Nucleic acid binder design. Sequence first.
DNA 1: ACTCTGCCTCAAGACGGT
DNA 2: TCTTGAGGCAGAGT
DNA 3: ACCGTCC
Length: 341
Amino acid sequence: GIQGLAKLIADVAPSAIRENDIKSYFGRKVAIDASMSIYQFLIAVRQGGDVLQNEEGETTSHLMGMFYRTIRMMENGIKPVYVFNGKPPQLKSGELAKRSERRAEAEKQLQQAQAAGAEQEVEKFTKRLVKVTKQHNDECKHLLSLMGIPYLDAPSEAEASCAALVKAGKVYAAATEDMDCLTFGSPVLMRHLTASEAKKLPIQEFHLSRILQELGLNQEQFVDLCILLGSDYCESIRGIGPKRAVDLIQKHKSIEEIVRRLDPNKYPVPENWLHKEAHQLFLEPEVLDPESVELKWSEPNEEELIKFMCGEKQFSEERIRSGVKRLSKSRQGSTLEVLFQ
DNA sequence: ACTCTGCCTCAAGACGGT
DNA sequence: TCTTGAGGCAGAGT
DNA sequence: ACCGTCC
Ligand SMILES: [K+]
Ligand SMILES: [Sm+3]
Ligand SMILES: [Sm+3]
Ligand SMILES: [Sm+3]
Ligand SMILES: [Sm+3]
Ligand SMILES: [Sm+3]
C-alpha cells in the first residue's frame, strides 16, 4: 500500500476517520478485496501448525473462512461483492520481486530450524511462506457462485476496481486494508469489517473528501503526496518522509515543482525515476466497467454446496446445512426479489 | 528538540457448546 | 502466478 | 466471552 498513510491521516486529518457500529450497516453493499481475505484465512485458520485439509491433501481453510465470514456479513445485512486481482502492473514488478526476497530469506531458513526441532519457529516461517495460487481463487469463485454471492474479476489491481465501483455508486465502500485504495480515488474505504461473535476492532471509514479537505489538496496533489510517502509502483525520495513531504506539497503542489525547487546536494533524486508513470497509473488505472455487470445476491444452491463442501472437501454436513439455512434466511431479510414490470 | 534512515521484530479466523 | 499492516530503537541528519 | 476444535 502506502507507507504509514493511516497514521498520517490519524494525526493530521482526524475528521476523515469515522466509526460506526456494525448494526448501522444493514442493507449496505460493500466491495471486498478477496485475495487479502484468502491470505488471512490461509495464515490464521490452522491447527497444530498444519492447515485444514481433506483426505486428498487439499487445503480447505480458505473455504472455511470465505463461507462462514460471508454468512456472518449477510446476517448483519451487509451485501458484499468479492473483487479478485488480475494482471499486476509492470511498475509493481520491482516490489513484486522484493516481496520474493522475503520468501527467499525464509524457505532456506525453514531448513535449519525444521531439522533442529523448534515447533513454534517452524510454524512462524511456514506462516510466512503462504502464497495464494489460482486453485485457491478458483475454488473460492466456485464457492461464492454456489452461495449466490457476486464476484468480479478485475483487469489489474482489485483495489482500483473497488474504487471504481464506489466512484460509480455500485457499492458504498471498499472493504480492504489496502490504503492505496484511497489513491485510486475511492471516496470511502472501510477497515476492520468481519462481524464476529467476539468482535475486536471497530469498523472505521476513511472518507477521501475529508482527507483532501484537512490536507488542503486535490486528487493530483494527494497522489503526489502518496508517491512521496512510499507507494508500491515507484521509489520515494531518500530522506523525505511524512512531516516533510506534507509541507513540501502544501507549498509546491507537485513533484515536478519540488524537484525544480530543491538542493540536490542534500536530497538527491532516485536514478531513472518513474514518478510520472506512477502518478499516471494512480490517477487513471486499468479498471473494469461498473455499468456492465449488475450485482445480484441470489438464492444459495444448498444441494450443490453439500456435494462440494461435504462430499469433496469433507466439511461436517450439519454445520454446512445450518449455515446455508442462515444464509438464505438473512438474504431473505435483506434483499427484495425480482419484480417484472 | 524534530525527523528520517534503516534496520530489527512482529501480525493477519470462526463454530458451538460452556 | 497475484494481498497487506504496525510498531521500536540507535544514530545520524534537519 | 473462554476454549477445544474445525478439515
Ligand atoms: K521515503
Ligand atoms: Sm495495493
Ligand atoms: Sm479433489
Ligand atoms: Sm538481510
Ligand atoms: Sm475427492
Ligand atoms: Sm425467490
